[PDB]
Ligand binder design. Structure first.
Ligand SMILES: Cc1cnc(Nc2ccc(N3CCN(C)CC3)cc2)nc1Nc1cccc(S(=O)(=O)NC(C)(C)C)c1
Length: 127
């Protein structure tokens, strides 16, 4: 089967704003996770075709990845910081759903999620 289209990253009909929290999510949170040694499998939508995973998009109906999250932030797609946080959580939980406890890719996600939670603990108060 084909890959689904990637999640929307721009919508000219969605209102836009800049907040210090969204700036932090891009400049601090995303940036720190992106450079992590275990980040690479989470940097783009899963290409189930190239990876030969016929069941991936049978199981994962709400795909999400850091490339999509980054594009959303660069485009001012998010209105609330919580939208972005929800997207990271969806990414992590999709990993845990598709795979099994103890799998290498799960350990990788766990490492990234721990770091994510550390950075979110330092989220500045909404100005
Ligand atoms: C975000 C994400 C969540 N789950 C899985 N699981 C996964 C993917 C591929 C495989 N295989 C199956 C065996 N086959 C020969 C190649 C890849 C196994 C599990 N992969 C993810 N991303 C991913 C992105 C790019 C490449 C790969 S990967 O290099 O094909 N797979 C591992 C070795 C990292 C697990 C994986």
């Amino acid at each position: 089967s084909m890959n689904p289209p990637p999640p929307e990253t721009s919508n000219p009909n969605k209102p836009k704003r800049q907040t210090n929290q969204l700036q932090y999510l891009l400049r601090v949170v995303l940036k720190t996770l992106w450079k992590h040694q275990f980040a690479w499998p989470f940097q783009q939508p899963v290409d189930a075709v190239k990876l030969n995973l016929p069941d991936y998009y049978k199981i994962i109906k709400t795909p999400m990845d850091m490339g999509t999250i980054k594009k959303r932030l660069e485009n001012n797609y998010y209105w609330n910081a919580q939208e972005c946080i929800q997207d990271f959580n969806t990414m992590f939980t999709n990993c845990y759903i598709y795979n099994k406890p103890g799998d290498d890719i799960v350990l990788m996600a766990e490492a990234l999620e721990k770091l994510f939670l550390q950075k979110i603990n330092e989220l500045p108060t909404e100005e």
